[PDB]
Amino acid sequence: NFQKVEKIGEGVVYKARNKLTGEVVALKKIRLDTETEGVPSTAIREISLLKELNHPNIVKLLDVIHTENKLYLVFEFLHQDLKKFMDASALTGIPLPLIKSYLFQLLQGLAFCHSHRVLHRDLKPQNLLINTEGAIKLADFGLARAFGVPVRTYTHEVVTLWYRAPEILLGCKYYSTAVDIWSLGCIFAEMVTRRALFPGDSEIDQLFRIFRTLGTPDEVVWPGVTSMPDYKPSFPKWARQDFSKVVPPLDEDGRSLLSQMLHYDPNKRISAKAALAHPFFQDVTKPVPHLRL
Ligand SMILES: O=C(O)c1cc([N+](=O)[O-])ccc1NCCc1c[nH]c2cc(Cl)ccc12
Fold first, then answer.
1. Is 122 known to be catalytic?
2. Do 136 and 129 touch, CB atoms closer than 8 A?
3. First vs last Cα of the chain: how many Å apart?
4. Which protein residues are within 6 Å of ligand 1, measured from CB?
5. CB-based contacts of 248, cutoff 8 Å, min separation 6
6. In terms of residue numbers, what domain contains 70?
7. Known binder of ligand: residue 252?
8. Beta strand 80-81 with 128-130: parallel, antiparallel or unpaired?
9. Domain edge (last residue) among 75, 96, 119
């Protein structure tokens, strides 16, 4: 009874409406690399469990449907995302109390999925859904390949690297939950400054933009970095910039927390659970955004 109303993202995502009840959902259609072989059972097993793992700051997975050549994921629908909201707020800034609320909520959602050994892997502002009630939710998890979904390969894919953790760019074979903390730290700085922190346009440009701000990492601040697969001794050596320059005019509580979310060493980067205890959040509230829907 659900019909496509409108394309809302590009898998490709549609606003779908029930032609009798009015109910609206987000329908995500993921094309596969095969026309006949469908999705392996083990991937459907892993995806399906997330229907029963719920948190207020994670988008709700409503149904999973698979065919010989497609995977469909049905999600709850929200009208807006943080990318759109920052663009609408870009000339003035999202107010600090709302920045703080959104960051706290996103840490709550990450603490939940990391506690269940699920990573997001691809956090971006456009993947963070917001509503009129002040909630923000993690969406568009980068789980297709981790679960074994045989997604269609795209030979000329243009990937946004801006939020990617430096251990990923240096070729780490195993990701940790810390990759999501890095991405969220980047998004935190973007809401504060109204500009993306590290908008690189290739993997080496992404790395060098990080290096020119936080300093070229070495064994002193990131033990093991020089053994990472894509580390090069010939990297240019940039001095570290102070966080007072990176995120003015964030107060020292916020700068403190941001420095721990952007720690080079993923083993020392603050956990989502520990970040919730940070003094930055001692006056946190739940304001509402003014949305033009
Ligand atoms: O967002 C997507 O596009 C997506 C794509 C695939 N995929 O393609 O394999 C699988 C899952 C996806 N989302 C899961 C969202 C979710 C609901 N409840 C959760 C509980 C935890 Cl702990 C962690 C995550 C969730």
1. yes
2. yes
3. 25
4. 28, 30, 47, 50, 53-54, 58-59, 61, 73, 112-113, 116, 118, 139-141, 143-144, 147, 149
5. 193
6. 2-75
7. no
8. antiparallel
9. 75
